[PDB]
Structure 1
Amino acid sequence: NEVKSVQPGEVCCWLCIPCQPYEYRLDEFTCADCGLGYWPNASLTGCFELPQEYIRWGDAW
């Protein structure tokens, strides 16, 4: 759920920042994201589809 924020700097000592909660982790050094209407994988390993919502047959509405 977190990425190593970069600073080549003096030495290779990294910071850590959690990604945007909808942005997953395809690279250890940078988050990744996918289209709107979509979602991150639980381990943030790719794009995931939020389940479609509609007025259902039995709902209160």
Structure 2
Amino acid sequence: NEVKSVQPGEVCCWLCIPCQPYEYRLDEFTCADCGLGYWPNASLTGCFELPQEYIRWGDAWA
């Protein structure tokens, strides 16, 4: 969950740091999701963002 390992040396206490929410975070060392793809998450299950429009007809600013 937004945390990925860094150190490629010792296989016992590799230095692990958090990975940014707009990253890939699928492999251990990868991160770096596709540019301008799915901002929240793009490697677990279809976490595509939504273009929230002004159409609500019940919203505060509607």
| TM-score after normalising by structure 2 | 0.49
SS in 2 for 1:17: strand
Q: Any conservation in 1 of the 2:3–2:17 contact (CA below 8 Å)?
A: yes
**Percentage of pairs with the same residue:** 100
Separation in 1 of the partners of 2:42 and 2:35? 17
- 1:55 is displaced (CA, Å) by 4.1
| Structure number with higher strand proportion | 1
* Aligned-pair Cα RMSD in Å: 3.5
Q: Any conservation in 2 of the 1:24–1:45 contact (CA below 8 Å)?
A: no
Structure 1 portions without partners, runs of 5+: none
The structure with higher relative contact order (CA 8 Å, sep 6+) is: 1
Q: Any conservation in 1 of the 2:24–2:30 contact (CA below 8 Å)?
A: no
Q: Give the number of aligned pairs.
A: 61
Structure 2 portions without partners, runs of 5+: none
Separation in 1 of the partners of 2:37 and 2:4? 27
- 1:16 is displaced (CA, Å) by 0.8
| Worse overlay, 23-32 or 6-15 | 6-15
Going from structure 1 to structure 2, the CA distance change for 1:56 and 1:37 (only over 3 Å counts) comes to farther
Question: Which residue does the alignment assign to 1:34?
Answer: 34
